[PDB]
């Protein structure tokens, strides 16, 4: 047996952050020896565990969130942080116990002119509870004037695109974040 981590980490195209495709891992053995000091793993924030002793902690379930965000938005993928990525877009629990993994993906997502297939939830007047998403879009956000239609200037369209460019920073580059969450999954 083996896990499908390389079906999760070494995948072709990831989710966006508004529609983070949660992938559940179970009935498996979880080898983390190829996963801690592999070369493109810039971020390996683990919270409830230690990654050296991740090979001998049996869990009954493993979730694997996965999306694509900016470099300087990995600061919100952490318990108890506020932005519009943890608040409005993807909330991580205060009782988090998994790991937050990320790596630069300027070659695979950002292109020379601009790649706009990645979207985030800028506007929402209710904070997200931990571990759920809203995928549906509608222009009616509660600014004022409840009239509905394809317009703006008081109520704006929620989803907006990242502007990804290669000569635009490394804190503004697509970081393919994979968030793990935690007795049939041993090491």
């Amino acid at each position, epitope marked *: 047996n083996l896990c499908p981590f390389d079906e999760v980490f070494n995948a072709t195209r990831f989710a966006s952050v508004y529609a983070w495709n949660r992938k559940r891992i179970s009935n498996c053995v979880a080898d983390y020896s190829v996963l801690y000091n592999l070369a493109p793993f810039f971020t390996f*924030k683990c*919270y409830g565990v230690s990654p050296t002793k991740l090979n001998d902690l049996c869990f009954t379930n493993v979730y694997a969130d996965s999306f694509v965000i900016r470099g300087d938005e990995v600061r919100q993928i952490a318990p108890g942080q506020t932005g519009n990525i943890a608040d409005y877009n993807y909330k991580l629990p205060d009782d988090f116990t998994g790991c937050v993994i990320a790596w630069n993906s300027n070659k695979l997502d950002s292109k020379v002119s601009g790649n706009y297939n990645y979207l985030y939830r800028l506007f929402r007047k209710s904070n997200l509870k931990p571990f759920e998403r809203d995928i549906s879009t509608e222009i009616y956000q509660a600014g004022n004037k409840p009239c509905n239609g394809v317009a703006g200037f008081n109520c704006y369209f929620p989803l907006r695109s990242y502007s990804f460019r290669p000569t635009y920073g490394v804190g*503004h580059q697509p970081y393919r974040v994979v968030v793990l969450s935690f007795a049939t999954v041993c090491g």
Partner: antibody
Amino acid sequence: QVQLVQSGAEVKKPGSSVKVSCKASGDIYSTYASSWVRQAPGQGLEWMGRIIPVSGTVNYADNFQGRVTITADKSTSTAYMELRSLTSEDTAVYYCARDVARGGYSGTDFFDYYYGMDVWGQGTTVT
Amino acid sequence: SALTQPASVSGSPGQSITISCTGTSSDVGGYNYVSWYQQHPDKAPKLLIYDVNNRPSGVSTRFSGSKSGNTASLTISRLQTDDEADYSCSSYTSSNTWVFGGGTK
């Protein structure tokens, strides 16, 4: 609290190569990361690079890409600095400091160093 | 690179001064992460502010910073007689770098 101890000065007139070692063995967690700055005589600081010794992930300022190679070993958790192709204008002071990770978690975060630099070395006045 | 900042300061005790650090809208203004350092003559610097306004523990009351959308600013009130040093800035700089802008002395 972390007790950075740095190397000695050098009188390397140009064309030489300089290594400066930043020995720190105090509150060495997995979140420890030692940045590197220049200070020229008479003007202000210039941040050079950054190392996370538990991973070896290296930042640079683009004025020091290919000039500096910040080497660090995981077990001793201390950092070196190989400035190469020197100039007489490179006579400066080269502190090492400690970037503060903002969070309680495991090792290897490339991004959390945005608090500041609290503790510093003692300066190697490399000429 | 090289956030401009004036190196001019009046050493008259009993008044209040203000030093404004400017910068582009990815260095300071793109972030709320401007920090400040003071430096001894020919020693290492030490930390005063970290985020915009804050302070670590061993920091006096008058050491306060502020932003203005694009031009960050520290101020000093009740200028103590022998406290003049080399004030230096920093910021998260959109590429994980810091950027120290000059000094003031």
